[PDB]
Structure 1
Amino acid sequence: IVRPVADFSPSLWGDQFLSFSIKNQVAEKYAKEIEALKEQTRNMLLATGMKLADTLNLIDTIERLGISYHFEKEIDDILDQIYNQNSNCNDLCTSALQFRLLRQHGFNISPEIFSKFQDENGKFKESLASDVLGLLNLYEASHVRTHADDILEDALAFSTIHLESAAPHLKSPLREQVTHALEQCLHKGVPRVETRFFISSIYDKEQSKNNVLLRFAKLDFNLLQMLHKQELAQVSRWWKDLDFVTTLPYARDRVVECYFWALGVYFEPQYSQARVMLVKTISMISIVDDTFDAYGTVKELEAYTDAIQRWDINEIDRLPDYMKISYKAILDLYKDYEKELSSAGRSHIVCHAIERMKEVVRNYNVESTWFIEGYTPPVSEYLSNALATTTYYYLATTSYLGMKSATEQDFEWLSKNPKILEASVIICRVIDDTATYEVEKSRGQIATGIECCMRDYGISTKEAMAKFQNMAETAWKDINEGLLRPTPVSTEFLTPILNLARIVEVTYIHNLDGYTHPEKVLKPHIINLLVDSIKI
């Protein structure tokens, strides 16, 4: 009979993104200067006879400035040289940076590089507590551990306590860099978010800074931002022409946040078509989610689920009027993808994303059934269903659609649920369940994962959320390990999965629902990435 009642916030943004006209003259000006600065930077990278520590800081600086996607060949060659030369005689600062940069790029450098900084007990020499730059680089490095790196077991706690201790008396911008590192490490942050912070709050205020790199980074950031705003304008126009804001009023209106997620998966210009496909899907499955999660009677969701499995416009008449709206929108979206990909003969690959979406919808229907029955499964059984309901198997598959170079063999690998994809999915699940345990346990929801975890192990909500946190930490060890050479597929198809995990950490930072309540977390990120340019 009657439905639930509306609890969701409206879009924060109105139509402020709907229209954006690129100032073409400015665009060409920026692009023209960048080409000159690009070659100056390349020559910095090819300069012969640099010290190890200077070469690492140059690579680090360029990566954090968001301009390393211009120099993948150069940076790879350099790190390849460093990996295969074994220079072990350096201080903590250089050693920890060396370790991090090589691991992030898939070079399996031994964690024994850290032996010289530990005593016979394997715990870090406390005499290092006053090397702030060394601690900072150790702190960052401690976040790329795999399961083989238990020698670094103490690195995070050791560096954290002493960085906290030093911070209030540090000079700027080092103090700000440390304070922000402690809030958000580099490895698990969204790359555009960290780049924007680094460029304007840190590097712009360093006395040592290289002016060519700073100017390069500002111009390149503001130039990509113009492309992002164009993309968001086109997606805003598509979303508005759908008009789910009035015809499907029960669902979250978050296409801007969805674009932010797509931007986190990749920011580079060559992934423009990919981002636009990805965001359309994210916002569309967000609708489907809210239909099971907050409007769908058990019967109604059954008709919807079967309709999705058969995947055929003939099925719309078995559905309620309001479900006809979302269902045809879904079917039309995939005919769109097919035509958009028809050009490059990449049309066939769409059925991979479709099959993964059928799978999501099947488990929405299960977990709905669990809530109406009030079933609290064992945690193993709960995860066996709740992993796919993250949508991360599905967004990961989708993310490949627009990538011009994704082949069938790539989708084939992704379909076998590889360990890197599984870890990213696990991180999303357990963090979502912690961040939104109350948000959901408001509406009498007893199907929550935490509740399963409490019932299963006979432990409190304390130990529950803890035990979930650990699964996230184990999963990060598996992501880091999935990045190491020889990689199963090209790094290009691993980075989107890594970035999915990063987006989880960033959106649900400090254990809050950042997607449903964007005001706290996501609004600042969106303003910094898509509203305000960097003051040049």
Structure 2
Amino acid sequence: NSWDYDFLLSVYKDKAKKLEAEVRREINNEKAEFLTLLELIDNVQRLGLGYRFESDIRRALDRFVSSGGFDGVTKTSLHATALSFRLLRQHGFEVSQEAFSGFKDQNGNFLENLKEDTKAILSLYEASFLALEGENILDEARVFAISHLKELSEEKIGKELAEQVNHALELPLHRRTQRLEAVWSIEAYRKKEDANQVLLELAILDYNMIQSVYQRDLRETSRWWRRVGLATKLHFARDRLIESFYWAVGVAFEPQYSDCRNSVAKMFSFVTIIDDIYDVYGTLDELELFTDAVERWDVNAINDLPDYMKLCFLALYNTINEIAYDNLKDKGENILPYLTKAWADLCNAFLQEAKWLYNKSTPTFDDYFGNAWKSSSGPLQLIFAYFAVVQNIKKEEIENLQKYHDIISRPSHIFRLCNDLASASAEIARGETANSVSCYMRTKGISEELATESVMNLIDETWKKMNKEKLGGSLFAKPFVETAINLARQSHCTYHNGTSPDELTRKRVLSVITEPILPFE
């Protein structure tokens, strides 16, 4: 495979193989107790090894379904029901929210006594986030579960169990990124006395092994950044190359995706610079020229651009033409049209923002946001990821992406929202209206708290839609759908509060890229 301990690794190569095999045997063990089998799969996934046993995990889930599994314990234990529900759906299996109806009273509410078992509550909570539109029971399940977890103290349950709850409350499993979940779960798993030493070692090894790939990737990308040295010449621009790669890892963590990673990290870096040129540095007349230049994509015309924009455009022009050349050489297809198109759209979105600002405009939430998620660069990032993740491009798919299909628009919605939500307070208090939350206030004539709650709910409804795209009725390949969704995941993991906001970030970036995980004891 493209991720085996032979294609990547190479004696450690031998230690990995032995451990990996042992785990496979465990997932495939047909004499295993279903509940134990599911908790195994759960650990393997949280620990970050799920991709390596993708096939095995399905095999297991299939035998579980084909035999009905514990179709009787779906009335006996909430924990099992929730875990099985979450895992089955996670893997495309069909499951009904009615599998929980047997946990509600006459009035139609989850029994109170359930709160006693803090484990089953966490499992239900986690399962609620994989809901679709219409599944009210799951919506109620989350409201019910959070009400209990909120109160839980370290004393009531214990240091270990409490960390689990605070972790879930911070960000649900379904929404956190694979790597971020991995670093946390490993540290948490290595502390357990009953921790599987074989699995623990594989997790550690595999994590550091992949992490090395990242460093090698960020290494070449940095080579590029330096030669381009766009930040050093543009005294106003900010450098965010490392921040960009970290972002990229969220979107495409699988090692085999170095391409997609470098492609997103480069794009995000450029989005950063060009973003500033539009809302802080350039004048409308200049932005107007830049926008026009991107649309024409003519190098023999970069002379109509002011010095600094000329330097910026050329760097962009080449980087893109370079990506196009790669595809041509590897796919025998000319994808330049689509790529340059994505940029024309983003710049026009950026220009729309610049104009609204200069003209003191106050567009309705609907209009502002409709432009905001496009100016987030999310859809552009995905369009680029598409060509880097799928080996066989289909005319039909690219056309849909070009028209901003829900597969990339939806996750972009969240991206923009999580962002504006972070800057909401500051920008609002600073008298600014250039913020989704602010528009929602003015448009609905409501307080900040109310506006914020609505943004949150809007996000929840978006997730439900995304979950449907992933479950079924999709034109795109599941892989890309998960990549698209990853952008939403990364947005949730990137815009937070914390310790210090800037502190939790520095830590994560170091835990995800720089520093490896402490060796196995």
Superposition TM-score tier, normalisation by shorter sequence: over 0.9
2:60 maps to 1:78: yes
Q: Kindly indicate whether the alpha-carbon contact (under 8 Å) linking 2:291 and 2:347 is maintained by their aligned counterparts in 1.
A: yes
Other structure's SS at 2:317 match: helix
CA offsets 1:179-228 (integer angstroms, 9 cap, x no match): 2122121111111011111011x111112221111101100001111111
2:317 is aligned to 331
- Pairing 1:237-248 to 2, within 5 Å after superposition: 237-248=223-234
Q: Kindly indicate whether the alpha-carbon contact (under 8 Å) linking 1:30 and 1:220 is maintained by their aligned counterparts in 2.
A: no
1:531 partner letter: T
Q: 1:230 to 1:532 in 2, by over 3 A?
A: same
How high is the TM-score relative to the length of structure 1?
0.90
Other structure's SS at 1:509 match: coil
Which residues of structure 1 form unaligned runs of 5+?
1-23
Aligned counterpart in structure 2 of residue 177 of structure 1, from 138, 159, 164: 164
Q: 1:455 to 1:173 in 2, by over 3 A?
A: closer
Aligned counterpart in structure 2 of residue 318 of structure 1, from 295, 304, 314: 304
Q: 1:54 to 1:497 in 2, by over 3 A?
A: same
1:93 partner letter: H
Q: For 1:353 and 1:102, how far apart are their aligned partners in 2?
A: 37
1:36 partner letter: K
2:379 maps to 1:393: yes
1:280 is aligned to 266
Select the structure that is richer in helix: 2
2:3 is aligned to none
- Identity of counterpart residues, as a percentage? 33
Q: How big is the shift at 1:381?
A: 1.8
Aligned counterpart in structure 2 of residue 525 of structure 1, from 492, 508, 514: 508
1:317 partner letter: N
Q: For 1:102 and 1:473, how far apart are their aligned partners in 2?
A: 21
Q: For 2:11 and 2:399, how far apart are their aligned partners in 1?
A: 43
Q: For 1:137 and 1:346, how far apart are their aligned partners in 2?
A: 47
- RMSD of aligned alpha carbons: 2.2
Other structure's SS at 1:396 match: helix
2:210 is aligned to 224
Q: For 1:485 and 1:359, how far apart are their aligned partners in 2?
A: 29
Which residues of structure 2 form unaligned runs of 5+?
1-5
Q: For 1:82 and 1:150, how far apart are their aligned partners in 2?
A: 26
Aligned counterpart in structure 1 of residue 276 of structure 2, from 278, 290, 312: 290
Q: 1:524 to 1:238 in 2, by over 3 A?
A: same
2:247 is aligned to 261
1:340 is aligned to 326
Q: Kindly indicate whether the alpha-carbon contact (under 8 Å) linking 2:28 and 2:59 is maintained by their aligned counterparts in 1.
A: no
2:129 maps to 1:143: yes
Q: 1:395 to 1:518 in 2, by over 3 A?
A: farther
1:505 is aligned to 492
1:40 is aligned to 22
Aligned counterpart in structure 2 of residue 426 of structure 1, from 413, 417, 422: 413
1:118 is aligned to 104
Q: For 2:474 and 2:63, how far apart are their aligned partners in 1?
A: 19
- Pairing 1:73-222 to 2, within 5 Å after superposition: 73-86=55-68, 87-90=70-73, 91-169=77-155, 170-200=157-187, 202-222=188-208
CA offsets 1:384-413 (integer angstroms, 9 cap, x no match): 222211111111111122225241243234
2:455 maps to 1:473: no
1:495 is aligned to 482
- Pairing 1:370-385 to 2, within 5 Å after superposition: 370-385=356-371
1:106 partner letter: G
Q: For 1:384 and 1:182, how far apart are their aligned partners in 2?
A: 30
2:45 is aligned to 63
Q: 1:520 to 1:378 in 2, by over 3 A?
A: same
Q: How big is the shift at 1:347?
A: 4.4
Q: For 1:412 and 1:520, how far apart are their aligned partners in 2?
A: 42
How high is the TM-score relative to the length of structure 2?
0.92
Other structure's SS at 1:459 match: coil
Q: Kindly indicate whether the alpha-carbon contact (under 8 Å) linking 1:339 and 1:347 is maintained by their aligned counterparts in 2.
A: no
Q: For 1:276 and 1:110, how far apart are their aligned partners in 2?
A: 40
- Pairing 1:411-450 to 2, within 5 Å after superposition: 411-441=398-428, 445-450=432-437
Q: How big is the shift at 1:66?
A: 0.7
CA offsets 1:312-351 (integer angstroms, 9 cap, x no match): 1122111110001110011000121123333323542343
Q: 1:486 to 1:373 in 2, by over 3 A?
A: closer
1:80 partner letter: D
Q: Kindly indicate whether the alpha-carbon contact (under 8 Å) linking 1:93 and 1:138 is maintained by their aligned counterparts in 2.
A: yes
Q: For 2:430 and 2:358, how far apart are their aligned partners in 1?
A: 12
Q: For 2:390 and 2:403, how far apart are their aligned partners in 1?
A: 22
